[PDB]
Amino acid sequence: MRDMLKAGVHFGHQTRYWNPKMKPFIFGARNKVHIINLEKTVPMFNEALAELNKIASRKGKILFVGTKRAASEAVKDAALSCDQFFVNHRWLGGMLTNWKTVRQSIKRLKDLETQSQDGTFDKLTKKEALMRTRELEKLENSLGGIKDMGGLPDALFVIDADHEHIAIKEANNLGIPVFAIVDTNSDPDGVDFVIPGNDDAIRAVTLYLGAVAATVREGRSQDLASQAEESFVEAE
RNA sequence: GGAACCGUGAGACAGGUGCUGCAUGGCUGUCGUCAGCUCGUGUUGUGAAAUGUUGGGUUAAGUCCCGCAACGAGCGCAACCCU
């Protein structure tokens, strides 16, 4: 299980771009950073983790959102260790509402690939061929992790409430739990299960994102394994 | 007996570029062949609607990025035909 006393990674962050709604989580600004209370972050871990093991052993799906280039690689690897979804690139309008039509783009993507591998690849003009290439690109860039979705999640996990504020909204009107590790620059009232921690910093996000993923595989139907996200922490 | 065309007598009936295209269909001219014109969804407004195509640098051009409540899509241009 997770470990306490993490005053060497997360802690305070951001200078003066905070939100008065995060006062009950700020220890005390010193020369710059406001500093977050590690004494309040721990209690949040328990409550947030508790609700996690509940949906984890309940065979519930989670969608880890991560558009920020600070945890772009961590959000994926963490979602790979387990059988969960994720959003790295950018978060279309009507993916869940107008699922049908949206999937039509997925089928076409699979239809073009089967035509790009070897079957009728260089039969028609090159101009038309270069037209099918761009389509594939645009489709592979947007429909990268949504291609595995064949049916409408139980909860979403964001890295930053503000950056992925759009994902938070659509997660509120639908009545779906929201888990995230944001800091000062945000509104906690928008997150039923918020984790007061550094939003940025790769070594900061990888820690929880790795522990949370480890707590998911355990108590479900798998054994614990070493985190491979630590290798990307060398970005420093 | 009787079909047909035709002529006279008799009966039932025809026609109109005569008016109105501010009653209209169709066709055509004109800004134009100039050119953009619109849709789905999200967001803003009580609403008619707005945003989407705002901002910074740039380009012949929404030409294209960066930031970005917007993200995408269908006619127009272009291409397809002919000298």
Side-chain angles (χ1 to χ4, degrees), chain A residues 33-122:
Chain A
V33 59
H34 297 299
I35 298 298
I36 302 300
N37 302 63
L38 299 177
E39 295 298 300
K40 285 62 179 59
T41 307
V42 179
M44 299 303 270
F45 286 128
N46 180 60
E47 297 297 62
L49 182 60
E51 183 65 298
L52 179 62
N53 296 60
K54 294 296 298 180
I55 57 181
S57 180
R58 186 187 303 178
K59 187 180 180 180
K61 60 178 62 180
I62 304 301
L63 193 172
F64 295 63
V65 184
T67 301
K68 183 178 298 180
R69 290 67 65 64
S72 60
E73 299 298 300
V75 62
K76 182 176 62 180
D77 299 299
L80 296 177
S81 300
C82 300
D83 300 300
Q84 303 298 59
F85 319 73
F86 65 73
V87 181
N88 179 57
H89 298 60
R90 192 177 69 66
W91 209 65
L92 295 302
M95 299 181 90
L96 295 64
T97 302
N98 194 304
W99 177 65
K100 202 296 177 300
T101 302
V102 178
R103 182 179 181 179
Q104 297 183 300
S105 300
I106 300 296
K107 183 178 181 179
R108 180 180 180 63
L109 187 168
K110 300 179 62 180
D111 180 60
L112 298 176
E113 296 183 300
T114 304
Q115 182 181 301
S116 61
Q117 297 182 300
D118 181 60
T120 177
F121 178 61
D122 58 300

Side-chain angles (χ1 to χ4, degrees), chain A residues 130-180:
Chain A
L130 299 177
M131 180 180 270
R132 301 182 297 83
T133 60
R134 301 196 305 176
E135 296 182 61
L136 288 173
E137 300 179 60
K138 298 181 179 181
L139 295 177
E140 295 181 60
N141 295 305
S142 180
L143 307 173
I146 188 63
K147 179 182 179 180
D148 183 60
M149 182 179 91
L152 300 177
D154 299 60
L156 295 65
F157 193 115
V158 184
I159 58 178
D160 187 59
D162 293 58
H163 197 303
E164 295 65 56
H165 193 299
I166 296 69
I168 301 300
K169 296 299 297 180
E170 293 184 57
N172 296 178
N173 62 301
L174 297 178
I176 302 300
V178 181
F179 299 64

Side-chain angles (χ1 to χ4, degrees), chain A residues 73-75 77-78 81 202 206 209-210 213 227-233:
Chain A
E73 299 298 300
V75 62
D77 299 299
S81 300
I202 180 177
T206 56
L209 293 177
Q227 175 182 57
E229 302 178 60
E230 183 179 300
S231 61
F232 294 113
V233 183

